Every structure is written in C-alpha cells, then in structure tokens.
Design a protein around this nucleic acid. Structure first.
Ligand SMILES: [K+]
Ligand SMILES: [K+]
Ligand SMILES: [K+]
Ligand SMILES: [Mg+2]
Lengths: 266, 68, 153, 164
RNA sequence: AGUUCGGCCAUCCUACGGCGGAAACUCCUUAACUCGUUCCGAAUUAAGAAGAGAAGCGCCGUCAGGCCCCGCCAGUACUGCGAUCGGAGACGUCGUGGGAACACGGGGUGCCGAACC
RNA sequence: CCUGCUACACCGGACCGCAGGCGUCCCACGGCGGGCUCAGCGAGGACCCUCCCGCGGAGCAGAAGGGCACAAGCCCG
RNA sequence: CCGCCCCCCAAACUCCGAAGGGCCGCGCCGCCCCGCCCUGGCCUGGGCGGGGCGGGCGAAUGCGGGCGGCGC
C-alpha cells in the first residue's frame, strides 16, 4: 500500500560514517585543522589542550596525536579538588579555572623533574595573585628554553562569551603555558577596553555567593532545595574568596599527582 | 496439454519457413515453462515442498523470519 | 578526440570507489615523508587543489622536494624516443608511501642476519629461479580409473 | 508504573493563515501569549489562491509550560470538551482549531476576528537524546508514545469526550 | 567493568524484542548572574543534587534484511600466441598458455592504543 | 576552445563520425567564522503549522561528466 | 496503489570483472662516535660532511658503453 523506504537496495548502497562520527563525539574538520603541521617538520610533536565537561566533572588533558593512537601526557580532573580544599560547587567557573591551573602546574613540574639550572617550572613560574588580567608567557621571550606551547581543543561545545572552557584555558595560562588567545569571550570586554575586576568576580565565584544570599533572603525553603550540599558542608556564601585563594596556594605548592588505588567490579 | 501434443510441431514447421536461415525443432524435458524436469517435478510435487504460484512452480524457501 | 581539456577522459579513473566517498582518513596527514623516498601517485577525486594530471595516475617516483603543504615528485616519462625526468608538485591526498623496495630491504636484512647467525657452513643466498623437481616416490595402491564420457545433449 | 514515563505537554503551537490583518492578528497572539509572534513567507505562487511568493502569508507562535497548558484548556472549553477519535496522530500528538478568536474571551472586535489552529505535542522525560547536539540518537520504540496512550492520558487529564 | 582522547572505517549498520547498574557516563531540577532562541532555556549558556533504571549506553536474542569468509558454479563464459583446419558465408574447430561473474549452499556478526576511576 | 561516446581496461589514436556546449552572467551569486539540514513519504490540524523516518533520491549561474551532509548546500555577522 | 514471481535489453547503464598491458625495485649494509646550520618546550629534528670497528658480492640469459658537431 505504502512504499517501503528501507529496502534490500537501500542497505546495499548505504555507507556508514566513522564510528566516532556516528557516536557524535568527534568533528573531523576541526580535528584536521588542529593536528595539521608543515611537512618539513618531520614528526615533531604537536600538542592539544583538550577541555571536556560532563555532568558532575571537568577534565583537562594535554595530548599529542601519533599514527595509530594518541598519547595523553598529563591529565587533571576536577574531582581531585576536594583534596586541595574545594568541597562543593564543582563544575562551575571557579572549579574550571582551578583545574586548568592544576593541569598546568603538574605538566611543567613533570617536565622539570631533574633539570638543575634552567627548568620550565623555575623559568615561567606562572602568575601568583589570581588577578584575572591579560597575560602572555610568550612576551617573556627567553632565547634558550621557550615556554610550553599547546592549542585549545574544545570539541562540540559552543564558544560563547563567558564559557567555562575559556575559564579553564585561562587557568592553564596562569599556570604558565603558551596558549594563543584573545580576550574576547571573557567577562569584562566592551571592545574598547578590558577590565580585570569583572573577571576576578567570576574566577572567585561571587555570583554563586550573591545568589545564595538573595535566595536565602527571599525563599529559605528553596534555599534548602537548591543548595543542600553547600548547607551540609557549611561553607558560608562569604568565605569563597578565601577558600579559592587557599586552594590556589595548595595547587601551586603540590601539583604532583597521587594515584588513588581502587578495585573495580564487573 | 496432451490434446495438442501431436500438432505443435506442425505449427512450428509453419513458423520455420518465415525466418532466415536454419532452425531446429526440439522437445524439452522440462515441465512446461517451469525450470524442473518432469520426473523431478513429479517427485517434488509428491513430497510437497514444491511452492505453487500463478503459472510457475518454485521450491521451499527455508530462509527468513520463522512464521511472522 | 576533438577536445583535450585538462580533465578529458576522466569519467571512471577520477570517480570514487563504491562506499568510499567523503573525507579522507587522517593518516593522509599523519604520515611522515623524507627526501629520496619512493611513492605511488593515485588521484583522489574529492580533493581538487594540487591534483596531478591524468597521465600521472598509477606511476611510481621519488621525492625531490619537501614543502609546507605539497610534496615534489620526480617521474620518468617516455616521449617519442627518449625518457624525460618530469617534476611535479602534489598535495598529500594524492600520494601514498610506496613498497617497491620492501622485498629488497627484507632480503638484505636476512642475508646479514644469517651470516651473523652462522650451521657452520654459509648457505647459498642468491635467489634461485624454480628448478626442475627432483626424483621421488608416490604410492599407487589406490588408483582411480577415468575415461572420456559420452556426449549428452 | 514507573516515573520517567509520565506524559507531559512538550509544546503548544498556535497557527494563523489568511494588508494589515496579519499585523492585527500578531497583536492578538501578542496579547494572548505574551511572546512576540513570528511570520512565515510563501514558498510558491498559487495565483488561484491569490498569493505571490515574497508575501508574508502566515503567522504563528509556540507556547510552553503552565502557560501552554492553560491556553489549551481554554481552547477545549471553546470546543465544549469534545474531540474526534481520529484526531490523534499515529505519532502521539493531536490538535484542533477554533473559528472565532474572541471565543476565548471578550475582546472588542479595533482588531478583527480570526480563527486558529491549536496543535498539542506531547512527550516524555528523556526525549532530549533526539534533540541535543552532541551524542544525538533516536528514542526507544518502547519509550515512544502510542495514540492509545495519548488518548488515554488526554481523557484522564482534561476529561474530554470522544466523538466518532 | 567504566570515562575522555584516538587508529583502521558495517564481522561495527538498520529493525523489533528482552536483561542491567556499586563506581562511571546519562535522563534529570532551577532561571539571580553569563549568554542566547526567523518566536520558544526545545537548542544553547550559567547554577544544582531530590528522583530513575523508562530511554540513550552495555549485553543477550531473531529458520531477521544488510555486511564479511569459504566451497561450488567451472577448467564452463571469455581470451594471448600458432595453423595451406572446416564452412558460400555468418561462425566454428585443433595445438600451446591465462581464466571469470551471476546464481547456489555452509559459516561468522569489531579488534588494536594512551590516560584516569 | 569544452563534455560524454566512437576508442578494442597505461598514454596516444581518423572522418563534412554520434549527442551537445563556448565568445557570457554575479560587490555578491565572492572571503572567513558560526549555527543548521535538503527532496520528500507516511500520519495529524478552522474555512500554512507539527511530528516521525529521511546516503542525498534537493541544491551548488549556463553543456555534459565528476565531486560534496555537524558540507562545497541554507541562514546570520 | 502495494508485495512475490517472470520473458527480453543498452556505444553515450554498471554492484562484479578477466586475458592483456603499464609504471617502479632486485647491493651495499649494520653499530658507535664527532663537526656545521632552517626547525622544536627541551638534552627536538632534518640536511651536509668526517672518523672507528664488523662485514660483503646476493635472480636468469646475452653483450662493451656514453656524448657532441656539420649536413642531406
Ligand atoms: K527458415
Ligand atoms: K606527451
Ligand atoms: K536504559
Ligand atoms: Mg569549529
């Protein structure tokens, strides 16, 4: 009665897309334009700085593409921060920035394990005070040991203005990595001037504290529903700046990773 | 059928004189315009796996969905 | 003929293979090339920049120039009584690394390997084209006897 | 019985087809949904129907949430709580259409009378997998909505009789 | 067992049924701030942590369609070299080399690599 | 000058051989970035709207052949 | 309209695909060091060269090879 669209011939003709394209986890146009490199360079490693978000976690990876696979050099997961002193609110702007800082410190300390006089952690020690201003490790221009260079890969997320992937890139930059970038798509840009306080606001997470204050002011019942874990951990909406400050102190002091043994069940 | 079995070759002989060159009249071993022989078609119809259709006979299929 | 545009006579050689349309896989750009290497030319019909003429499809040559985006390849081409050494500039989608000396490198390595491994006598290492076969024994305790059959028609 | 299978009103679409009558109808949908409406252009030229191409032919608006549900309740009450058995799509939606817009509520006819298409689209929790951008799949055929479940839910919620 | 990044691109696809969840991914809750919808927080952006194994996902199934391997089809079709072979011709034959496809039947239905739980 | 075929699977190969095209058109019908998905079939809705499936069956100035789907098509800056 | 069968086709139809052709290769290699300069986060590469020890003649058949000038 009705013609059948999926036939013998339809299936015989059908070409399947690459597995990771069918699963919707890769864009190969962007992947080509990221891993491309001039052919008179003869297998010199190129590096992506990959930022990925899930529900309940943030991942930052430094990666190089080989023939049959690709090496992750350093990794840093935002669920380690509870160890450094950030118990709740993970997956917000502050945690994205802090995880970027963690990955940067860990990479540079790792590649400066052993070197005595000129080591990429003593050279290029990052930025300390968490000021949220423009900064570029490539302006320093040491002429014998350059800064570590990577390019920001963000996959399928949107490059909106005020995005957590850019926050994490900023934290890596403050840790001391060369990551070429503009300040467009950061909070505090009017196209005729960029400011630093309106960026430190989101870095230190004042929006969350202001929202807790006003929500607790009008509706306490919904305060309890919205923020139950914040209440349970008793971190008041006013101590966040100190908590982030100390978190940064610990991250810079001990960026080394500790391998959590575990036992996985089928 | 068996009614015209004697006169088909007469009609084909009439036909042969209208075509250029040399042509051969033959009687096949198959059953009608079907693709089995008469004796194989016999046994096949006798055991029952032979599928019928409008004017042609096929075999049991044995492949695909079981019944539904 | 009466017409010889650049892509005359390309209806089949430049068409893409069945269920092999779309973007190239990325080994096309992760392969590493060197000066002096051997390559085959095969035109991929989806990539239009730096696409060699039809004469060069199915030939083997040597790299003379490594460039930022294209490779330089030397091809010997016969013209009307002599051979000419032609030089072309081809982008990566149209070249593959060639295996024309794979067998030779295998044999050289094996020759040195067996010389080191020597068993005290050194084996003959020259390739030997198939010889006539030696004398041997076959049992015939179970022969099958066949004959021409009769014409069946 | 399980949650995640509860039916819900995915969206309501109000649609109008037909100088400045569309301006006035846009005012009507404007004040009746509190959302700027949208216009749609004519694909072809049907001179029998009296339309060029570049003309603004239709207007429409899409409402969601408690707002969509309240407007659709009042639309059924215009329809006297009656619905055809055959009006439920094979895919789990339905709809209808009023003929005189002020049958929603007394409005000085100023802006003139129009008739509208209500179209209700239902869904379940978990239908995001077919509309999100990354890792977009198709919904399970069992998790999908049948017209039987659709009529059952609509009758149990709004208590509408079925003409046949 | 799982997640992120990949290689080769269906033995991995499509359709319909079933079975799972400790950890993980997912569905999921909100619209102060950020940003955004030819209209719409559907999408996307920001902020969560009450609720799920109903979906996606993992796995099992089906005289399943597709896809892949083997045998047969068949030394058949076709064809390189040689012939003062046959025949009015159209075409065929012999000698010496190469050798298919369709159809048909039995089998099968992703593995490799880097990092973390 | 150009496409497909003649042409007998590298290249080349004749005829007043076969079926045809060119002397133009576009500051956007161009460059780049982002987002999106087309032709339709089926089922619904007062006298264009919605869902679902959708290997391209559309489109890409003009001949023919080839090419292209988070694009080479459409929309916005 | 839809589904199963079915006779017969294409120089400008092809999911398959010969015989037949075509292009390239068949001797120098390994291991260690040292010198020079566009490229890389670097103690990276890549190219061009020097040294030092292990070796070595690696299908068949036939046979000397290459370059120019002037001219019909
Ligand atoms: K005759
Ligand atoms: K030539
Ligand atoms: K599930
Ligand atoms: Mg992009």
């Amino acid at each position: 009665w009705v013609k059948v669209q999926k036939t013998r011939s339809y299936f015989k003709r059908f070409q399947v897309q690459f597995r990771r394209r069918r699963e919707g986890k890769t864009d190969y146009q962007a992947r080509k334009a990221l891993i491309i490199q001039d052919k008179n360079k003869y297998a010199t490693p190129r590096y992506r700085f990959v930022v990925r978000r899930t529900n309940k976690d943030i991942i930052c990876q430094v990666t190089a593409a080989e023939l049959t696979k690709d090496r992750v050099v350093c990794a840093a997961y935002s669920h380690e921060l509870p160890r450094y002193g950030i118990p709740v609110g993970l997956t917000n702007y502050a945690a994205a920035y802090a995880t970027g800082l963690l990955c940067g410190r860990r990479l540079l300390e790792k590649l400066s394990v052993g070197i005595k006089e000129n080591a990429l952690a003593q050279l290029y020690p990052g930025l300390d005070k968490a000021t949220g201003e423009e900064y570029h490790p490539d302006e320093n221009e040491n002429e014998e040991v350059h800064a570590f260079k990577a390019f920001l890969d963000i996959g399928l997320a949107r490059a909106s203005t005020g995005a957590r992937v850019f926050a994490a890139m900023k934290g890596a930059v403050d840790a001391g990595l060369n990551i070429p970038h503009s300040m467009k798509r950061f909070p505090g840009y009017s196209k005729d001037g960029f400011d630093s306080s309106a960026l430190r606001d989101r870095i230190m997470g004042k929006h969350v504290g202001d929202y807790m204050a006003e929500l607790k002011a009008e509706d306490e019942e919904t305060y309890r529903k919205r923020f139950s874990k914040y209440i349970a951990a008793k971190v008041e909406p006013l101590r966040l700046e100190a908590m982030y400050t100390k978190a940064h102190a610990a991250i810079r002091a001990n960026p080394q990773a500790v391998k959590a043994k575990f036992e996985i069940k089928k | 059928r068996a009614s015209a079995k004697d006169y088909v070759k007469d009609a084909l002989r009439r036909a042969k004189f209208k075509i250029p060159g040399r042509q051969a009249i033959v009687e096949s071993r198959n059953w009608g315009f079907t693709e089995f022989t008469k004796e194989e078609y016999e046994d096949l119809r006798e055991r029952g796996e032979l599928q019928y259709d409008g004017n042609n006979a096929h075999r049991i299929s044995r492949k695909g969905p079981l019944n539904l | 003929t009466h017409s010889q545009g650049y892509r005359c006579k390309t209806r089949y050689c430049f068409a893409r293979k069945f269920r092999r349309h779309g973007m190239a896989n990325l080994t096309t750009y992760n392969r590493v090339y060197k000066l002096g290497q051997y390559v085959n030319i095969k035109v991929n019909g989806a990539y239009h920049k730096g696409m060699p003429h039809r004469y060069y499809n199915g030939r083997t040559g040597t790299i003379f120039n490594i460039g930022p985006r294209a490779l330089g390849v030397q091809i010997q081409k016969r013209v009307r009584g002599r051979i000419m050494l032609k030089r072309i500039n081809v982008r990566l989608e149209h070249v593959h690394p060639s295996d024309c000396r794979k067998n030779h490198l295998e044999r050289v390595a094996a020759n040195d390997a067996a010389r080191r491994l020597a068993g005290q006598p050194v084996p003959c290492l020259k390739r030997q084209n198939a010889l006539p076969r030696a004398a041997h024994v076959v049992s015939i305790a179970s022969a099958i006897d066949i004959t021409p059959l009769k014409y069946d028609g | 019985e399980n949650p995640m299978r509860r039916i819900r009103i995915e969206k309501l679409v109000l649609n109008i087809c037909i100088g400045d009558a569309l301006t006035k109808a846009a005012k009507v949908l404007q004040q009746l949904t509190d959302q700027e409406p949208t216009f749609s252009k004519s694909r072809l030229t049907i001179r029998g129907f009296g339309i060029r191409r570049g003309q603004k032919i239709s207007t429409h608006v899409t409402v969601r949430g408690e707002k969509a549900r309240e407007i659709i309740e009042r639309g059924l009450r215009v329809k006297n709580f009656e619905l055809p058995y055959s009006c439920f799509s094979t895919t789990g939606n339905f709809g209808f259409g009023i003929t005189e817009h002020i049958d929603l509520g007394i409005k000085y006819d100023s802006m003139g009378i129009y008739g509208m298409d209500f179209y209700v689209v239902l869904s379940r929790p978990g239908f995001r997998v077919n509309k999100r951008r990354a890792q977009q799949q198709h919904v399970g055929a069992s998790h999908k909505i049948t017209p039987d479940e659709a009529r059952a839910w609509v009758e149990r919620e709004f208590e509408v009789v079925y003409t046949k």
